[PDB]
Amino acid sequence: PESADLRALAKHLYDSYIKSFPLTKAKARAILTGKTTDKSPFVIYDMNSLMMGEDKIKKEVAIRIFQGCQFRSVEAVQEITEYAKSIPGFVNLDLNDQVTLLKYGVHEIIYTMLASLMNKDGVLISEGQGFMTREFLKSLRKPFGDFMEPKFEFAVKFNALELDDSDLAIFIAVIILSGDRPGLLNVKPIEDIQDNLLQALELQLKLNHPESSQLFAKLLQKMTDLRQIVTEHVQLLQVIKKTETDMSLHPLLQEIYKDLY
């Protein structure tokens, strides 16, 4: 009936999601489990490992890490913007709203997606070719040692919900289309789309996890956690942007962070 239109939207978004993102939760788990046919990731547990590992990857250690982390985020933003464009109705909006939606959305989605890549112990990197340990990241000097830790904490809770790439494809769409971001010119059409996306997300959770109930409600509670986690992060960038003049922030990243929370 209507459940058809929503089933369609969910498949369109999954398709778009898979085209747009190189490393899915599917392969990432396979790699993390190790139950895969590919060569294991080069573990990075200390400065020695890091230096040996430098060859298998795309200035003091901590600041080097942060610049890689920077390079990668920018690629994330491109993958996310490409995806946003494939959300039915997204590109019909005011271009200034598109920018605002993304400006506020991207860090929420990075963290959602980082979590596909994380476990209690550490995080995959360079498209599953590295595995940088959580112990190693904590160990970095202030402020850098507290930079990734809030994201591991979030990840352990979020990964519990045992979501699928197909669930995430819609879940990230719903995030992008948040009609309650600072400075939108025309909220109604955004909210229109989000209601569709939220119905499709609800259907998808009933269908894909018919044994689990309230995954939908659990999942919407997490959407509020992120905004906080993202604020905590933007704050940290201010701290880093000030106490280090040795580093330069990437132009695209500046765009996002300037006049943001």
Binding site: T81, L95, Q98, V99, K103, P251, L252, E255, I256
Partner: peptide, 10 residues
């Protein structure tokens, strides 16, 4: 938001 516009515009 120069680059964002560009990215979106593409």
């Amino acid at each position: 938001h120069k680059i964002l516009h560009r990215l979106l515009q593409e």
